[PDB]
Amino acid sequence: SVPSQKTYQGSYGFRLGFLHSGTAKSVTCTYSPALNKLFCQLAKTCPVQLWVDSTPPPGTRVRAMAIYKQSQHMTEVVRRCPHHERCSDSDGLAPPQHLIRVEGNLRAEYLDDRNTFRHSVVVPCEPPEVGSDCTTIHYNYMCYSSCMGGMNRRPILTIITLEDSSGNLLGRDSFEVRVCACPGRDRRTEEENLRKK
């Protein structure tokens, strides 16, 4: 009833990577290594790199799922709030309840788990474009961390799993997410709080 968040590189040496976007007031997505935390604006592009040491088999897929970070909320399904699930901002593929979307990939599949009711979005693994050393997925987060009746100020983490064609685990990584109006300032604030602690 709670998905694992254990980092697991597995046989293929799977791990995530993030750009270095800085903390200017205008930034729309920025990752803090010190906090292992992505800060992003509502519905804006979040580039997440996938890195491996060796090529996984054809049919390998990459799944994203959100869970609440705090143990007393971990069993609650992370979903969009009562406002955003009704705002008809559909892309034709993502169910309106799903917090996490993949942008610009017609092969993205969205799962409502029949037993846990949790949401996830999964895409096929594709090799890097010629001249690149990693593959990038573009995610969108479709509610603010603060949305009442949804995340309601509770922190979440995104779990990224590398899976075989049956859905068996090959690799896992994760990061905390805050969806907020000013990710640059919030990253600076939280990094300073960490330093002061």
Ligand SMILES: O=C(O)c1cc(I)c(-n2ccc(F)c2)c(I)c1O
């Ligand atoms: O180099 C390759 O040949 C190569 C092949 C693949 I399929 C992938 N890959 C894509 C998504 C993922 F989770 C892993 C990657 I990243 C690669 O660097």
Ligand SMILES: [Zn+2]
């Ligand atoms: Zn919302």
